[PDB]
């Protein structure tokens, strides 16, 4: 690979002028890769708030034969796949539901079994043209995965993690489901003897922490669509930053290639816009009592993240999001130094076709530049942070009768 710097820039968090320091390319657009996910994080924090929960509702009606019909009124929870399903099945059994006759769901019930795994973390997030096409696929996933025997290995890994955050799950959960179909919200009205039960996701801050630890494309793309997509994003950023297409041009929430191999399309912005995003996201989280480390990964301390391997002066001092696509490798976040907290962004150009004997070049240049920033500012100052365990649910997610 051959590499060169597109731009690097930075700003003290307490600057009274909010002038951004950096090279002469700091106001030129460059591909962002997954540092796009911090922009989606800021939009989601501003629109929904860090303590927002996706409230998926189950409408449960007893049946004549002693079982239940259940209709899922979806919430567009963007992290509802295998692990939330396992928790839901545990919770159904805790609520004495073991057999379902008719399971139906609406167009806001988004289910992607592998949402937190390969290949959805790094894949092209499915984009459906109609709700019927989406639901065809959700029905198939409910039939093949939700309704069939639970994997003992994945389930016991989840249950042990859930216990660490104070959530109870049963040892041998099991559900039987007779029939599964799509019912649009406009075609659903509850039965007279139905009980509504609410399954809340973990708070948005936790969903964002998991996304920004893993670099999860599925979660990022579905948050961006849920908030209105590109037309809504462009208006949000024009109203928030007085920015326009010359500052920032997005097409999806993840930063992944949104086009074809021969016509690729990547989110782009200027380095200065990345600093203004971080300043605004830090300000919105502080108003709710949170820090960037509540939604972004901490070097070394978040071992289940793309910066768990980072060491040196960044370990424990630096909160940051990585990105990589064919032509760009990027990093942005904050460094905590003896002279205070400093926002930064580093945007590198990569060419993988050349000098194939050379690898890890852009990553190591970025680490060296960020380390230098910390050291010019008196060295690292450890932040206050305990490694989080961000699962799709928490101890307030239990099914609860409304």
Author numbering: 37 to 438
Copied sentences from the primary study:
Bdellovibrio bacteriovorus are small predatory bacteria which invade the periplasm of other Gram-negative bacteria, round up these (typically formerly rod-shaped) prey bacteria into spherical, osmotically stable structures called bdelloplasts, kill the prey and replicate within them. Essential to bdelloplast “sculpting” is modification, by the Bdellovibrio, of the prey cell wall peptidoglycan in the prey bacterium's periplasm. In this study we have discovered a novel use of some evolutionarily diversified class C PBPs, by the predatory bacterium Bdellovibrio bacteriovorus HD100 when they invade prey and construct the osmotically stable bdelloplast from the prey cell. Compared to the active enzyme, Bd3459 (S70A) bound significantly less Bocillin-FL as would be predicted. Together these data establish that Bd3459 is a PBP with DD-carboxy- and DD-endopeptidase activity, as suggested by the bioinformatic analysis of the protein sequence.
We solved the crystal structure of Bd3459 to 1.45 Å and this revealed predation-associated domain differences to conventional PBP4 housekeeping enzymes (loss of the regulatory domain III, alteration of domain II and a more exposed active site). Bd3459 is comprised of three domains, two of which are found in other PBP4 proteins, the classical “TP” transpeptidase domain (domain I; K38-D87 and P239-L427), and an associated domain (domain II; Y88-A238 and P428-C terminus). The largest structural difference in Bd3459 in comparison to the PBP4-grouping of enzymes is the absence from Bd3459 of a classical domain III, an all-beta structure that sits adjacent to the TP active site in conventional PBP4s and is responsible for PBP4 dimerization. Domain III has also been postulated to regulate substrate access and limit the ability of PBP4 proteins to bind bulky substrates. It is of interest (and relevance to the wide diversity of bacterial prey walls that Bdellovibrio attack) that Bd3459 possesses no compensatory regions in this part of the fold, leading to a much more accessible active site. The domain II:III:TP contacts of housekeeping PBP4 enzymes are replaced in Bd3459 by a region of novel structure, composed of AA 144–210. When building and refining the Bd3459 structure, it was apparent that a covalent modification of S70 had occurred during purification/crystallization. After being unable to crystallize the protein when HEPES/MES was excluded, we have tentatively modelled the adduct as a covalently attached HEPES molecule, with disorder distal to the C9/C10 atoms. The tetrahedral arrangement of the reacted sulphonyl group is reminiscent of a transpeptidase acylenzyme transition state, with atom O1 occupying the classical “oxyanion hole” formed by the backbone amide groups of S70 and S360. When comparing the Bd3459 and PBP4 structures, this sequence insertion takes effect between N292 and N303 and forms a “thumb-like” hairpin on the periphery of the active site pocket.
